[PDB]
């Protein structure tokens, strides 16, 4: 039974190492969510600092890949950082070679191709991570593209990742079934973040303090993460209506 | 254009006696019409009762002597502290010099 | 490390056989039968396509018979994809020889080169061998008309008539019975088709299940012509010989 | 399977230990060192009477002052001999002198452990390296595939080794002559050999300061065999 | 590159891959070598399971390495081509650098060295081939006959056989070949070579190949009819 | 580090089977149905856009891909494997042909190059075979229209019409009854939609179906005017609206 | 058990069995003792023979004028490692006109041995080394294990029955450290230490091997009748 | 080296090559054979830079001899000449080209025809009835243009060759120490020992 | 089963058992800690005295990287040294190209990526060390801890080795009782105490205390070893607290 140890086909036509890499994805027990506004793309993720000895400012699964592209990871931090460093290098090389900023979907495809190679070549293992790339693309507008250990990737209206992804997914599905549009009809990104947090609260059934969340926002020509105090202001506005 | 060679002057002299030998050399080091040092040793005790001097371009001379001294050290390690005879040292030095047949040590050597 | 997963494709059995070569030959025994018959005035190549469909585009299809140059052709038995790798190498070797010596490559020299490549995969590299057996049909001015075969072991031999693929035991017996040295091409054509008709696993032998080719000096004066038969031409020769 | 450079739980390299078993199956080779010279002798062991025995070359010249006998997978020895000859002559080129027997032996033994996943396995042959130099005089070395080499006053290797070594234990003393050593090798070879010893299935050689390394003629050895038979019948 | 050590020692001190290569030689067709007073003859078996063969173009069992040296073999056919090619290249390489053709002993030593190298090199398996190398040294009238095997050992033989049922024909040669008086003529040498193969071959038709090599690059292969005359004469004497 | 898997991972078993190729074909069997039909004046290739989530934008995932202006491709099996094959197929069309001869390769030769790449993954060291079967439709001046299937082994066959994946056995039977040598392109599209409806469970419309054709030259899709000999690509992907229009006449 | 096939595999308890098996080869090896004072450092080694006709395998190797070691285990591996030390000592002299510090020599050996314990294909070194030397910070003694662990000590012993000599040195610690400016008495303490590891056999003239280095003493080895003084 | 001539007659090819070898101002040898037998019915003469000539010739010889043994067959003169041309055309763009000009005289046993090929160091091949390299043609071609017929006997070819050498000996400043003449025909290669 | 026999193989859980086995080697090692203070960091380690023959203060365990970073580790000591050698190469190339000394977070990722790389292939073994490291840069003080998996985070206090639980408990008290912060000299005293308290898990053999520190005020942002009077002062403070 060595067909379960390396990335070769089982008799059923399956790659067990890829399937087990998907299971490593949920090892952190963190849930993430991404939605699109008119002018922005928002990504939120649960933040859990179990140890009091940790410096909470260094605990993060959201990465600034380029000025325009942000990336949230679902999976262990070593693989997450491996993917982050590679994506940063690829984004920079692209700009140097082709004279313009690497689009979000193109980076996703590139990282997905790298993931595919690990599923075909034996000496390389898959990374046990799911990568969600976000930006406000200059051609396509607000963009969410997600990559997994199988080498699969696709664009999204909105998306969710983690142990309780299904609950969040259905919650979002039901909202877009009502509104009948592919985005959150809202002007400011502040209110789009408030929407994202509100719908995560409803789906998971848990309340959040300022230190329980982690937020990333993509606007035209820049991606940035919110501080604890920026999130607190967001939580206050939710409670006051 | 860069010239990797130079001339540090000096003169050396070796004479073989019946049961002794001498190797002499002046201690002056020069470039062009200037004196670098009035006392810069040029003849060296290399071990195993062998003395050596590489005259001409000092940098190449120092490198060769340094390499031969090293060759004596490794001759002891590899051959059970055997004494390196003068005839064996001479042959060894020929191969040290010919290693740079196409970028020579610009020196006239006496042991 | 990686050693754990190595099949070791290039080793002897205790009996002194090469495992992978033997298993590759087992693969080839399930492939469509290919027959070669050499006559005094030409060579015949016949081969059976494997369980086809009505929706297969036959006239543009090629799975059995391939052209190496103007003088030499091959019939294939085994993995088609493996065979095409080798065929393209053989085509290049023939052109290299022509560029070097300004003469068409002798048949045996081309055969030896391909057979040497196959041999290499059985002795070094740790890769699986090519699951292919060839029948070479060719002509040169030294030995005239020649038939050769090569298999995954890289061993090659010359023949007057030979079969590869499925039912070679039965096919070789039938050829050995009816073959004669003073035979001609038209007779050899008939023998090849009759042998396939009796050895085939199909219910009946039809034009759409066959590939056919001849190498004749039946070209205007001292020169050689290769004829890869078209579907309609295979249908005609089947009626002529009285099989359909 | 398992690594080629793997240690056993006892702290030994599996492959080196297994190569030693191959050497035990090899034909017998004996060396005896004296103050008048070193004698090397071997069992030829032809597999058939049609095999021309004089083509069996299990005693070999490395330099004028160094000889070598082999036992085990003798085909493996050819590259070792080639390296030894090259090392001996190369040192003569660099230093205008003969190379020390120990230094030559050390150079050969440096090849031994150059195996892994370099060559794919250890050598399956042991060597008796005999010679003379000005510093340490007449010497006999036993070079194994482990990379280890011991100096010996007398040594036997091959299938009849432990029986021969026990005999060499009793017979050797520091005042042996060359003639006495010759007869002693013949005596012990005759004892451990399957077939009856003669000039065609056994070979002698020696290394002296004056004449250097010499392989003995079949006519010369035949006389030493006849001299042996008579002196054993003398008591 | 593929570096895997395929030929390795076993607990009992055997290299199984080298020994299994000898089993491939045992499977191969019988080859025999007999040297007379002024010649050497190489005999080879052709298995008659393969008829409808084209004997003009089929690779002959005996191969010329140079104008004065020949090589026959038993074992894997494809493997033998690689040794023959290397040998032929070395023969021309020796003529080019030393200005003399190879001695038979030198050529044998080279081929045996190649076989040995493939028993302790990574990623390769041993040659499943044993060879008989015969010929005459330049400006020498003494016959030469050598044998090699997968392990890489080689030796000189007055007469030798290799391949399937080689045990039987070696038995025949050991009692029939006299060293004090070897086959004085070509006829006697060929006759003894054919006789030895008739112990094993089956039919004396197209199953026996004979190649005579004489001094000064005089090499010829006998035809079917010439060999058939030896086969006829042998059995007619046997009916008594 | 270093790739130490320099040995084959696909090997012959005692029965003569190449396991990894067979297992790759099994992966293709599990894959979504795709098909191809050849007409007199064109070729059509089609498949189902099996969306993994309704939140996912299935327009961004392209199962039918342009390889050259006159050649297109569709697959069944593992999507990621297909994606990288398309990337390599597009590149090899330039490096091994267009940069040499100054024109795009004919269908059969591009197929041959793709087949070679897939064969090498079946024999080279430290790799598994591609888990896809490709259907490649194309046109060129001297061969006309053509349709090819390419399997994980590297073997390729020309077809008049065929299907691969989930419901291929049923679909091939359906095509045998409907296909003839006098079909016009619109008739082939109609048959493609009928055949594909049988294998689809859920929604069946322009947004859940991906369909492209190799047909007439499209000068409107060229992007420039002024060169008479350049008349535009023959490959065209049908829009969501164009599919739905033909579903009313179904 | 299942985790001892190669050096690249941890066991479930976090052990490296191939390294532990290499460590076992040292225990089979002949005993050797190391000890130092503030002025000198001494190596004492019990040499082993194959039989009565054979020579006694050399245990001590010189690396530089101011540094050398003694070995226990696979002798060829000691030759490889000592050769490396010779080169490193030599690189320090030729480039920096600087005698290599004994502590830095230990760090280099540690790092060389470590690479063999983390990579596939290779194997750990099957030898233990005792390095003595005199540098700018005085006399030094190091113990090298092929796991990579190098330890600076006042005194130690490795090989078969080495525990007896190690206990003796642990008692004598306060005495032999004070033996300054007296090479003969320091050697006596080393010979008396190695004697605690002997059974059946005793120290003979071609059995014993001693080495010393110090303030105005280059690394020199004593064998044969040169050690009869200490028997 | 200096002068190499070639002439193809009815049933043979005749190659004439100078005997002189010069180092500095001194003639070291006056009996040098500037030729190599490539196969029993193929002969190659050569001229060019010192050392390169023999090296190249012997390298070609080894390759053709290797081919002969492998196939048990003699390559045609045309095939050999094409192999030689390729080796020179390969050589001219090398780091250090081989500065060798050759004439290849052979008898094709299949076609029963003599054949003469002239190839220079660039890899410029031409089949000719008569040929030369260097300055040799400047003196000799006018005689050959006048006297040459294709139906000439071997004896007539030798007489016309003598006239060419006499003209060279009269009008060339260099003393080339006469020529060694060799004939290539159906029976093989032989040397004319008196010329 | 068989998933734990090879590195870089995912078990059906999604775990790399070979990395988890490397952690067992870390847990087997001696105790080492790190404390983040007001303007710097303090490192301390337990050195087991196996024998009287060990020369005191000679077998130094804590290692410096560049001139501003300190590294300490528990587990397989050679593996730790290998990691520091790489760290020194990374820090050198950073300074070569960018001029400024390597920032601590930047340095932490360099080690992290390198350790993580040894979980990607079966041809290499994971590191048998957890490494505590840190120092002072332009943005102030930073303390990090790096596991065999390549996982690392920033810390207020950090501990690893056989006595990590005991140490962690003591570190948690300091964080609670000093929200405003701890001074550099206080951190040295506390570091000594914690190692002494953590020595109850290795109580068979006696030990030697080793401390180092980087502080903006006390060491000018350079890594230095605590020596002489300041070391003895910390030992006395530690001994007073256990009694
Ligand atoms: Cl890519
Ligand atoms: Mg993999
Ligand atoms: Mg010309």
Closest approach of chain C CAs to the CA of F9, in angstroms? Answer: 8
CATH of domain D1-235: 3.60.20.10
Measured from the Cβ of residue I104, the count of other Cβ atoms closer than 10 Å reads 24
Cβ contact (<8 Å) for G90 and B77? Answer: no
Alpha-carbon distance G45 to G197, whole Å? 11
With H, G, I as helix, E, B as strand and everything else as coil, classify residue I87: helix
Integer CA distances (angstroms), G52 to D106, D184, G195, I22, I52, in order: 22, 18, 22, 48, 39
CB G18 within 8 A of CB G126: no
First to last CA, chain C: 61
The single-letter DSSP state of residue A141 is: E
Integer CA distances (angstroms), E163 to E20, E111, E149, E191, E208, in order: 14, 18, 11, 20, 14
The single-letter DSSP state of residue D196 is: P
Question: In DSSP terms, which residues pair with F133 in a beta bridge?
Answer: F76
Look at the block and give the residue holding tokens 């510093």.
Answer: D135
| Sequence-ordered list of residues with C-beta below 8 angstroms from that of I223, at least 6 positions apart, any chain | I64, I67, I68, I69, I70, I135, I212, I213, I214
Integer CA distances (angstroms), F66 to F42, F54, F87, F90, H134, in order: 16, 26, 10, 8, 62
Nearest-by-Cβ selection for D100 from B80, B90, B95:
B80
With H, G, I as helix, E, B as strand and everything else as coil, classify residue F135: strand
Cα dihedral C102, C104, C108, C114 in deg (nearest 10): 80
| Sequence-ordered list of residues with C-beta below 8 angstroms from that of E90, at least 6 positions apart, any chain | E102, E107, E110
Measured from the Cβ of residue A85, the count of other Cβ atoms closer than 10 Å reads 16
Total number of domains in chain G: 1
The single-letter DSSP state of residue D152 is: B
Alpha-carbon distance H10 to H16, whole Å? 17
For each of the domains in chain F, give its residue range(s) and CATH number, in order of start.
Answer: 1-250 (3.60.20.10)
Per-residue HEC secondary structure of I99-157 comes to: CCCCCHHHHHHHHHHHHHHCCCCCCECCCCEEEEEEEEECCEEEEEEECCCCCEEEECE
Q: With an 8 Å Cβ cutoff, is I220 touching chain C?
A: no
Cβ contact (<8 Å) for G53 and D154? Answer: yes
CB F35 within 8 A of CB F164: yes
Measured from the Cβ of residue E176, the count of other Cβ atoms closer than 10 Å reads 12
Number of H helices and number of E strands within chain F? 7, 11
- Approach to solving: X-ray
Integer CA distances (angstroms), G160 to D9, F128, G27, G35, I241, in order: 16, 52, 5, 18, 44
Cβ contact (<8 Å) for F129 and A9? Answer: yes
Q: H51: burial class by Cβ within 10 Å (0-12, 13-18, 19+)?
A: exposed
Cβ contact (<8 Å) for E88 and H72? Answer: no
Alpha-carbon distance H59 to F223, whole Å? 60
Cβ contact (<8 Å) for I18 and G156? Answer: no
Fold assignment, E1-240: 3.60.20
Tokens of F56: 């996912």
- Ligand 2 centre and the CA of A120: distance in Å? 6
CB C169 within 8 A of CB C199: no
Cβ contact (<8 Å) for E88 and H69? Answer: yes
The single-letter DSSP state of residue H74 is: P
Q: With an 8 Å Cβ cutoff, is F99 touching chain I?
A: no
Alpha-carbon distance F167 to F190, whole Å? 18
Provide the domain limits for residue G208: 1-231
The single-letter DSSP state of residue A225 is: E
Q: Edge-to-edge, what's the strand order for the sheet holding C210-216?
A: C161-164, C34-39, C42-48, C210-216, C225-228
Chain E residue with the nearest C-alpha to that of H63: E92
DSSP letters for F85-133: HHHHHHHHHIIIIIHHHSSPPPHHHHHHHHHHHHHHTTTSBTBPPP-EE
Q: Residue E92: its chain H contacts at CB < 8 A?
A: 62-63, 65-66, 69
The single-letter DSSP state of residue G210 is: E
Alpha-carbon distance E50 to E56, whole Å? 14
Alpha-carbon distance F127 to A120, whole Å? 6
| Sequence-ordered list of residues with C-beta below 8 angstroms from that of A224, at least 6 positions apart, any chain | A64, A216, A217
Q: With an 8 Å Cβ cutoff, is D22 touching chain E?
A: yes
Torsional sign, CA F130, F131, F133, F134 = negative
Chain D residue with the nearest C-alpha to that of G8: D3
Provide the domain limits for residue A1: 1-241
In chain E, positions 3-22, which contact chain F (CB-CB < 8 Å)?
A: 3-4
Measured from the Cβ of residue E10, the count of other Cβ atoms closer than 10 Å reads 15
Ligand nearest to the CA of residue H126, numbered in listed order: 3
- Ligand 1 centre and the CA of A107: distance in Å? 9
Q: Residue E160: its chain D contacts at CB < 8 A?
A: 48, 50-51
| Sequence-ordered list of residues with C-beta below 8 angstroms from that of F171, at least 6 positions apart, any chain | F33, F35, F163, F195, F196, F198, F199
Alpha-carbon distance A130 to A128, whole Å? 7
Give the angle E16-E19-E25 at the CA atoms, nearest 5°.
Answer: 145
Closest alpha carbon to C6 in I121, E3, A16: E3
Chain D residue with the nearest C-alpha to that of C4: D1
Tokens of I227: 């020596």
Q: Edge-to-edge, what's the strand order for the sheet holding G60-64?
A: G60-64, G67-73, G127-135, G138-144, G150-152
Q: With an 8 Å Cβ cutoff, is E64 touching chain H?
A: yes
Alpha-carbon distance E78 to C121, whole Å? 11
Give the angle G103-G107-G111 at the CA atoms, nearest 5°.
Answer: 170
Cα dihedral I222, I226, I229, I233 in deg (nearest 10): 120
Return the exposure string of C204-219: e unless at least 16 CB atoms fall within 10 Å of the residue's CB, then b.
ebebebbbbbbbbbee
Cβ contact (<8 Å) for B91 and D102? Answer: no
Q: D123: burial class by Cβ within 10 Å (0-12, 13-18, 19+)?
A: buried
The residue among G1, G4, G10 with the most chain I CBs within 10 A of its CB, best to mutate, is: G10
| Sequence-ordered list of residues with C-beta below 8 angstroms from that of I127, at least 6 positions apart, any chain | I22, I75, I76, I79, I82, I83, I115, I118, I148
Alpha-carbon distance G160 to F199, whole Å? 77
Alpha-carbon distance H85 to A235, whole Å? 86
Closest approach of chain E CAs to the CA of D123, in angstroms? Answer: 8
* Class of C1-244 in CATH: alpha beta
Closest approach of chain E CAs to the CA of F7, in angstroms? Answer: 7
Closest alpha carbon to D76 in D121, D113, D43: D121
- Ligand 2 centre and the CA of A20: distance in Å? 12
Beta strand E63-64 pairing with H12-18: unpaired
- What is the 3-state composition of chain E as percent helix, strand, coil, each rounded to the nearest 5? 35, 25, 40
CATH number of the domain within which A43 lies: 3.60.20.10
Provide the domain limits for residue I71: 1-243
Tokens of I66: 């560049």
Chain-centre distance of CA F67, in angstroms?
10
With H, G, I as helix, E, B as strand and everything else as coil, classify residue C150: strand
Question: What residue segments make up the domains of chain E, in order of their start?
Answer: 1-240
CB C140 within 8 A of CB C106: yes
Question: What residue segments make up the domains of chain H, in order of their start?
Answer: 1-195
Q: Which residues of I are catalytic?
A: 30
Alpha-carbon distance B31 to D95, whole Å? 36
Chain G residue with the nearest C-alpha to that of B73: G64
With H, G, I as helix, E, B as strand and everything else as coil, classify residue D202: strand
The backbone torsions φ and ψ at residue F136, rounded to the nearest 5 degrees and listed phi first, read -115, 115
Q: How many C-F residue pairs are in contact by the CB < 8 A criterion? A: 108
Find out if CATH 3.60.20.10 is the number for domain H1-195: yes
Q: Locate the DSSP E strands across D17-113.
A: 29-33, 38-43, 59-63, 66-72
């Amino acid at each position: 039974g060595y067909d379960r140890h390396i990335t070769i086909f089982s008799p059923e036509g399956r790659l067990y190492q890829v399937e087990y890499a998907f299971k490593a994805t949920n090892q952190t027990n963190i849930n993430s969510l991404a939605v699109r506004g008119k002018d922005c793309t928002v990504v939120i993720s649960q933040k859990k600092v179990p140890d009091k000895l940790l410096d909470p400012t260094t605990v993060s699964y959201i990465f600034c890949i380029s000025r325009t592209i942000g990336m949230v990871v679902n999976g262990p931090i070593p693989d997450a950082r491996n993917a982050a460093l590679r994506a940063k290098a690829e984004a920079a090389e692209f700009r140097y070679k082709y004279g313009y900023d690497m689009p979000c979907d193109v980076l996703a495809k590139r990282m997905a191709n790298l993931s595919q190679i690990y599923t075909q070549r034996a000496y390389m293992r898959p990374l046990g991570v799911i990568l969600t790339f976000v930006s406000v693309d200059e051609e396509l507008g607000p963009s969410i593209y997600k990559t997994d250990p199988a080498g699969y990737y696709v664009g999204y209206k909105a998306t969710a990742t983690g142990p309780k992804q299904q609950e969040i997914t259905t919650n979002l599905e039901n909202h877009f079934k009502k509104s009948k549009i592919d985005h959150i009809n809202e002007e400011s990104w502040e209110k789009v973040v408030e929407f994202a947090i509100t719908h995560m609260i409803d789906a998971l059934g848990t309340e959040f303090s300022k230190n329980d969340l982690e937020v990333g926002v993509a606007t035209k020509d820049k991606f940035f993460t919110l501080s604890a105090e920026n999130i607190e202001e967001r939580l206050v506005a939710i409670a006051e209506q | 254009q860069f010239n990797p060679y130079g001339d540090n002057g000096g003169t050396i002299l070796g004479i073989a006696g019946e049961d002794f030998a001498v190797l002499a050399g002046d201690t002056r080091n020069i470039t062009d019409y200037s004196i670098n040092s009035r006392y810069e040793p040029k003849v060296f005790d290399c071990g195993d009762n062998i003395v050596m001097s590489a005259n001409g371009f000092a940098a190449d001379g120092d490198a060769l002597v340094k390499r031969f001294k090293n060759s004596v050290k490794w001759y002891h390690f590899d051959h059970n502290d055997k004494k390196l005879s003068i005839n064996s040292a001479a042959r060894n030095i020929q191969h040290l010099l010919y290693s740079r047949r196409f970028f020579p040590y610009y020196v006239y050597n006496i042991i | 490390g990686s050693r754990r997963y190595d099949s070791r494709t290039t080793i002897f059995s205790p009996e002194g056989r090469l495992y992978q070569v033997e298993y590759a030959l087992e693969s080839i025994s399930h492939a469509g039968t290919a027959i070669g018959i050499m006559a005094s005035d030409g060579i015949v190549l016949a081969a059976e396509r494997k369980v086809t469909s009505t929706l297969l585009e036959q006239d543009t299809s090629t799975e059995k018979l391939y052209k190496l140059n103007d003088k030499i052709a091959v019939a294939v038995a085994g993995l088609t994809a493996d065979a095409e790798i080798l065929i393209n190498t053989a085509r290049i070797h023939a052109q290299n020889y022509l560029k070097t010596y300004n003469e068409d490559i002798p048949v045996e020299i081309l055969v030896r080169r391909l057979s040497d490549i196959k041999q290499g995969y059985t002795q070094h590299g740790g890769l699986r061998p090519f699951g292919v057996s060839f029948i070479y049909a060719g002509y040169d001015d030294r030995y005239g008309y020649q038939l050769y075969t090569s298999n995954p072991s890289g061993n090659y031999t010359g023949w007057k008539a030979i079969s590869v693929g499925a039912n070679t035991s039965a096919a070789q017996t039938l050829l050995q019975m009816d073959y004669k040295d003073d035979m001609k091409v038209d007779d050899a054509i008939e023998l090849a088709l009759k042998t396939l008709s009796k050895t085939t696993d199909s219910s009946a032998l039809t034009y759409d299940r066959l590939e056919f080719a001849t190498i004749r000096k039946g070209a205007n004066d001292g020169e050689v012509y290769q004829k890869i038969f078209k579907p309609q031409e295979i249908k005609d020769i089947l009626v002529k010989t009285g099989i359909t | 399977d398992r690594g080629v450079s793997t240690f056993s739980p006892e702290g030994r390299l599996f492959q080196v230990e297994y190569s030693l078993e191959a050497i035990k199956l090899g034909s017998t080779a004996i060396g005896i060192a004296t103050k008048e010279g070193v004698v090397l002798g071997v069992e030829k062991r032809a597999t058939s009477p049609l095999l021309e025995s004089d083509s069996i070359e299990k005693i070999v010249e490395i330099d004028r002052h160094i000889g070598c006998a082999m036992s085990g997978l003798t085909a493996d020895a050819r590259s070792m001999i080639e390296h030894a000859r090259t090392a001996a002559v190369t040192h003569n080129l660099y230093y205008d002198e003969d190379i020390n027997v120990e230094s030559l032996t050390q150079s050969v033994c440096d090849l031994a452990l150059r195996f892994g996943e370099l060559m794919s396995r250890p050598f399956g042959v042991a060597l008796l390296i005999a010679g003379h130099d000005a510093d340490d005089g007449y010497q006999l070395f036993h070079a194994e595939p482990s990379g280890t080499f011991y100096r010996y006053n007398a040594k036997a290797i091959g299938s009849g080794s432990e029986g021969a070594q026990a005999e060499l234990l009793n017979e050797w003393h520091s005042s042996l002559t060359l003639k006495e050593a010759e007869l002693l090798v013949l005596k012990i070879l005759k004892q451990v050999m399957e077939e009856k010893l003669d000039e065609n299935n056994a070979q002698l050689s020696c290394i002296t300061k004056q004449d250097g390394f010499k392989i003995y003629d079949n006519e010369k050895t035949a006389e030493l065999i006849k001299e042996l038979k008579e002196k054993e019948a003398a008591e | 590159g593929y570096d895997r050590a395929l030929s390795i020692f076993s607990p009992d001190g055997h290299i199984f891959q080298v020994e299994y290569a000898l089993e491939a030689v045992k499977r191969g067709t019988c080859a025999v070598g007999v040297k007379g007073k002024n010649c050497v003859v190489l005999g080879c078996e052709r298995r008659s399971t393969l008829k409808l063969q084209d004997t003009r173009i089929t690779p002959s069992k005996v191969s010329k390495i140079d104008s004065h040296v020949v090589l026959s073999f038993s074992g894997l056919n494809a493997d033998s081509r690689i040794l023959i090619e290397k040998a032929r290249v070395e023969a021309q390489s020796h003529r080019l650098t030393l200005e003399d053709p190879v001695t038979v002993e030198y050529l044998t030593r080279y081929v045996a060295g190649v076989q040995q190298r493939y028993t302790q090199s990574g990623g390769v398996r041993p040659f499943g081939v044993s060879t008989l190398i015969a010929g005459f040294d330049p400006r020498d009238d003494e016959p030469k006959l050598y044998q090699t095997e997968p392990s890489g050992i080689y030796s000189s033989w007055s007469a030798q056989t290799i391949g399937r049922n080689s045990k039987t024909v070696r038995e025949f040669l050991e009692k029939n070949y006299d060293r004090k008086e070897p086959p004085a003529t070509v006829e006697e040498c060929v006759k003894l070579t054919v006789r030895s193969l008739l112990e094993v071959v089956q039919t004396g038709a197209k199953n026996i190949e004979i190649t005579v090599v004489k001094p000064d690059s005089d090499i010829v292969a006998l035809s079917s009819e010439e060999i058939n005359q030896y086969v006829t004469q042998i059995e007619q004497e046997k009916q008594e | 580090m270093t790739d130490r898997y320099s040995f084959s991972l696909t090997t012959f078993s005692p029965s003569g089977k190449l396991g990894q190729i067979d297992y790759a074909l099994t992966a293709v069997k599990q894959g979504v149905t795709s098909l191809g039909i050849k007409a007199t004046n064109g070729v059509v290739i089609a498949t189902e856009k099996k969306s993994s989530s309704p939140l996912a934008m299935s327009e961004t995932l392209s199962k039918v891909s342009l390889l050259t202006p006159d050649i297109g491709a569709v697959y069944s099996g593992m999507g990621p494997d297909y994606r990288v094959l398309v990337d390599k197929s597009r590149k090899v069309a330039h490096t091994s042909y267009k940069r040499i001869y100054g024109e795009y390769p004919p269908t059969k030769l591009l197929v041959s190059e793709v087949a070679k790449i897939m064969q090498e993954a079946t024999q080279s060291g430290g790799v598994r075979p591609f888990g896809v079967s490709l259907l490649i439709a194309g046109h060129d001046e001297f061969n006309g229209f053509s349709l090819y299937q390419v399997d994980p082994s590297g073997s390729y066959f020309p077809w008049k019409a065929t299907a691969i994946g989930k419901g291929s056995v049923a679909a091939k039977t359906f095509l045998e009854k409907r296909w003839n040598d006098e079909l016009e392109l619109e008739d082939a599209i109609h048959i493609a939609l009928l055949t594909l409806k049988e294998s689809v469970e859920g929604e069946f419309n322009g947004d859940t179906i991906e369909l492209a054709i190799i047909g007439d030259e499209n000068p409107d899709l060229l992007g420039y005017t002024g060169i008479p000999t350049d008349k535009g690509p023959r490959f065209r992907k049908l829009t969501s609206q164009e599919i739905n229009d033909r579903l009313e006449a179904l | 058990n299942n985790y001892d096939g190669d050096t690249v595999t941890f066991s479930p308890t976090g052990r490296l069995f191939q390294v532990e098996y290499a460590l076992e080869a040292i225990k089979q090896g002949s005993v050797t003792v190391g000890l130092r004072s503030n002025t000198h450092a001494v190596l004492v080694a019990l040499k082993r023979n194959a039989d009565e006709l054979s020579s006694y395998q050399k245990k001590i190797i010189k690396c530089d004028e101011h540094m050398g070691l003694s070995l226990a285990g696979l002798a060829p591996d000691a030759r490889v490692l000592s050769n490396y030390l010779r080169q490193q000592c030599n690189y320090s002299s030729l480039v920096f006109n600087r005698k290599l510090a004994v502590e830095r020599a230990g760090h280099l050996l540690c790092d060389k041995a470590q690479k063999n314990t983390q990579s596939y294909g290779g194997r750990p070194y099957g030898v233990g080394l005792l390095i003595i030397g005199y540098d700018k910070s005085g006399a030094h003694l190091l113990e090298f294990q092929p796991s990579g662990n190098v330890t600076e000590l006042y005194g130690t012993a490795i090989g078969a029955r080495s525990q007896g000599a190690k206990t003796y040195l642990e008692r004598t610690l306060d005495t032999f450290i004070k033996i300054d400016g007296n090479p003969d008495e320091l050697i006596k303490a080393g010979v008396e230490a190695i004697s605690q590891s002997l059974r059946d056999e005793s120290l003979t003239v071609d059995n014993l091997s001693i080495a010393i280095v110090g303030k105005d003493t280059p690394f020199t080895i004593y064998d044969g009748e040169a050690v009869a003084k200490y028997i | 080296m200096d002068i190499i001539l070639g002439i193809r007659v009815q049933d043979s090819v005749i190659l004439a090559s100078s005997k002189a070898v010069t180092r500095g101002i001194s003639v070291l040898k006056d009996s040098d054979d500037k030729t190599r037998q490539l196969s029993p019915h193929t002969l190659m003469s050569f001229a060019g830079e010192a050392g390169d000539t023999v090296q190249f010739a012997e390298y070609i010889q080894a390759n053709i001899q290797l081919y002969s043994i492998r196939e048990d067959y003699e390559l045609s003169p045309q095939a050999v000449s094409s192999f030689v041309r390729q080796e020179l055309a390969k050589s001219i763009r090398s780091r250090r080209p081989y500065q060798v000009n050759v004439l290849i005289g052979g008898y094709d046993k299949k076609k029963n025809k003599p054949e003469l090929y002239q190839i220079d160091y660039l890899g410029t091949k031409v089949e000719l009835p008569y040929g030369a390299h260097g300055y040799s043609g400047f003196y000799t071609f006018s005689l050959l243009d006048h006297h040459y017929r294709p139906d000439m006997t071997t004896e007539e070819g030798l007489d016309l060759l003598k006239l060419c050498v006499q003209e060279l000996e009269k009008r060339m400043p260099m003393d080339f120490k006469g020529v060694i003449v060799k004939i290539v025909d159906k029976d093989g290669i032989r040397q004319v020992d008196d010329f | 089963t068989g998933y734990d026999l090879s590195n870089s193989v995912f078990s059906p859980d999604g775990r790399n058992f070979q990395v988890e086995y490397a952690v067992k080697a870390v847990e087997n090692g001696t105790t080492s800690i790190g404390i983040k203070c007001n303007d710097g960091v303090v490192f301390a380690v337990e050195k087991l005295i196996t024998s009287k023959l060990l020369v005191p203060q000679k077998n130094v365990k804590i290692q410096v990287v560049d001139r501003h970073i300190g590294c300490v580790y528990s587990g397989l000591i050679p593996d730790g040294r290998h990691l520091v050698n790489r760290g020194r190469e990374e820090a050198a190339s950073f300074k070569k190209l960018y001029k400024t000394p390597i920032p601590i977070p930047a340095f932490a990722d360099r080690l992290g990526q390198y350790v993580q790389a040894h979980t990607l292939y079966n041809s290499v073994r994971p590191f048998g060390v957890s490494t505590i490291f840190g120092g002072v840069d332009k943005n102030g003080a930073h303390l990090y801890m790096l596991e065999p998996s390549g996982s690392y985070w920033g810390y207020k206090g950090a501990a690893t080795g056989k006595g990590r639980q005991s140490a962690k408990a003591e570190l948690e008290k300091l964080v609670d009782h000093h929200p405003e912060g701890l001074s550099a000299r206080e951190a040295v005293k506390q570091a000594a105490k914690i190692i002494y308290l953590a020595h109850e898990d290795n109580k068979e053999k006696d030990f030697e205390l080793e401390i180092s520190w980087c502080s903006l005020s006390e060491t000018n942002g350079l890594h230095k070893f605590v020596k002489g009077d300041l070391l003895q002062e910390a030992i006395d403070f530690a001994q007073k607290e256990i009694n």
